[PDB]
């Protein structure tokens, strides 16, 4: 259900991975990388999922524009049929 990613406090790409983990109640074994988020999203996570990412361009600069590729994985997951609503605030 409703998870809020504030792209101001996302220091690095690892920061992000820890937030996604506690926010989407990801596996304790979670590998904190994109292959791992893909598997958690297509094979672990409860649906419906609605993801609010506030402040995305800040997020991008801070994360050396690597936030975009984890945004891409949620889009791909959604194109495969996952019940994910993305709200780019």
């Amino acid at each position: 259900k409703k998870a809020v990613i504030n792209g101001e406090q996302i220091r690095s790409i690892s920061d992000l991975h820890q937030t996604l983990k506690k926010e989407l109640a990801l596996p304790e074994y979670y590998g904190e990388n994109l292959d791992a988020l893909w598997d958690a999203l297509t094979g672990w996570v409860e649906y419906p999922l609605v993801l609010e990412w506030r402040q995305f361009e800040q997020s991008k600069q801070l994360t050396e524009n690597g936030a975009e590729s984890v945004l891409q994985v949620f889009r791909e997951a959604k194109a495969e049929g996952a019940d994910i609503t993305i709200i780019l605030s």
Binding site: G31, N33, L34, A36, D39, G43, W44
Partner: protein
């Protein structure tokens, strides 16, 4: 049931027969049968099956990419309930690799 689910078991079958064991269905095929992942119910809707056969996109580029080569993946050591962190990764030209840490490192095993 007919199960082959270990790293050596599945690796040797992929090398020999160029096909995954029959106890593997893809996420999609499983979702159709009633698998909803957060309930951890693969065994009720598809007893004896594991998740395997799906394309692996190799998103962190940790595995040897080359043009024409697709990668795919499958669960290893699964029986019942919630999925674990062990996976085998196989290519179209049969390179085989494995991960036990939910894709952080990968070991070539064949």
């Amino acid at each position: 049931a007919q199960v082959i689910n270990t790293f050596d078991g599945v690796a040797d079958y992929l090398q020999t027969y160029h096909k995954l064991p029959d106890n593997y269905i893809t996420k999609s095929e499983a979702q159709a049968l009633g698998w909803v992942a957060s309930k951890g119910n693969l065994a009720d809707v598809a007893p004896g099956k594991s998740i395997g056969g799906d394309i692996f996109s190799n998103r962190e580029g940790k595995l040897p990419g080359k043009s024409g080569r697709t990668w795919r993946e499958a669960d290893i050591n699964y029986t019942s309930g919630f999925r674990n962190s062990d996976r085998i990764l196989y290519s179209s030209d049969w390179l085989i690799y494995k991960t036990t840490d939910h894709y952080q490192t990968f070991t070539k095993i064949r």
